[PDB]
Ligand SMILES: Nc1ncnc2c(CN3C[C@H](CSc4cnccn4)[C@@H](O)C3)c[nH]c12
């Protein structure tokens with residue numbers, strides 16, 4: 100077995116795992132709670148980071164450095180950009196960018212800063228494992244690019260602009276930051292999102308309606324990956 | 329003595345300290361280099377994080393968790409909002425917000441997410457120590473609010489809007505994120521910025537001209553604080 104981090108942003112994205120696991124302990128650290136449970140031969144560490152890039156960066160860092168995570172699976176919801184994605188559909192990120200990281204005034208591409216790249220990649224072995232699990236459970240699973248930033252996108256123009264620049268299939272507020280931390284600390288990273296809305300007009304209303312259910316779809320899937328790991 | 333972290337974003341903000349310290353060792357970690365030196369009775373850990381909120385969050389996390397920092401001083405440059413600030417002037421942050429953290433579609437104020445606050449405070453003892461050092465060296469030192477986000481601000485409208493919303497005296501891309509990490513990990517934090525530009529039209533040109541010198545002004549000051557610690 101191994102130490103597996105399971106990370107989400109909101110309580111809704113992680114509580115379904117805690118209710119399935121039943122027996123777990125808690126540690127208060129980094130102004131948050133981290134949850135610990137056995138599952139098969141593995142030792143799980145779970146948390147919801149709170150929303151956004153800074154919060155998620157800190158949690159990923161803590162789970163690896165303090166709690167010894169050897170793999171990190173991210174589970175949660177996202178806003179769909181690709182028109183073929185429907186609410187509830189699962190998307191794993193092959194790579195991710197920060198659409199709101201902007202020193203373009205100095206001639207750099209949007210999302211780029213010196214020492215880093217525009218896209219951060221997820222782990223190929225974990226991605227292939229997800230494809231196997233999807234086949235076994237007869238679940239539709241799409242591969243794609245996720246654009247991350249610290250804004251809830253609910254505007255057709257913004258949606259279109261970010262989709263065009265990064266060829267992004269969905270948006271959210273934690274993926275690129277988590278994948279960056281994992282890459283930096285040499286930990287294999289998997290980023291899974293279930294669609295809660297289509298990031299346009301009324302996206303906030305669709306989010307409210309579908310978040311609880313979409314969060315469970317993603318959460319169930321990452322736990323099924325822990326079985327195969 | 330104690331373990332003191334000195335953190336900047338860019339090489340220009342930290343290399344002046346390395347040239348003064350002369351004798352230091354290096355460790356490659358978290359896709360970056362961290363520098364280690366004795367100074368008086370203290371053990372220093374230094375680094376430039378690379379630009380932005382995610383990079384700075386990760387470095388602060390690493391310096392505390394992995395390298396045992398008991399205090400963290402941030403040194404660097406910033407864009408002036410307060411009209412009384414001139415290029416080269418020093419500003420320490422009493423508190424900081426993320427101006428680009430936005431779930432306003434759900435009714436929340438700009439900069440607010442659940443579980444967190446709009447402003448993060450710096451450490452009062454370190455701030456008072458800075459005021460003493462400023463008096464001793466006959467250096468003009470202003471206290472103020474810093475607005476942090478992942479954009480280089482070089483636009484009068486954006487400058488004015490961020491200044492108005494947060495009552496911000498300057499802007500930069502790392503302060504709020506660093507101060508948040510330090511608070512979360514119970515480490516006293518000090519954030520010092522020397523002005524490199526006025527965040528308006530041509531801010532990119534003023535930055536290029538004044539970054540090296542303004543960075544030295546800030547860097548000299550934090551090293552003087554390490555003498556009194
Ligand atoms: N269109 C979109 N744009 C940006 N992100 C998303 C997401 C995914 N999550 C939801 C949540 C912000 S909404 C939130 C709602 N209520 C309370 C707190 N946060 C953040 O963790 C990112 C789903 N759809 C998105």
Ligand SMILES: Nc1ncnc2c(CN3C[C@H](CSc4cnccn4)[C@@H](O)C3)c[nH]c12
Nearest residue numbers: 337379405406407479480481499500501527
């Ligand atoms: N007006 C302003 N807006 C936002 N931030 C600032 C800063 C402070 N720094 C400079 C740098 C972006 S410029 C940069 C240029 N070349 C390479 C990397 N970064 C980032 O670390 C924040 C000074 N003035 C600012």
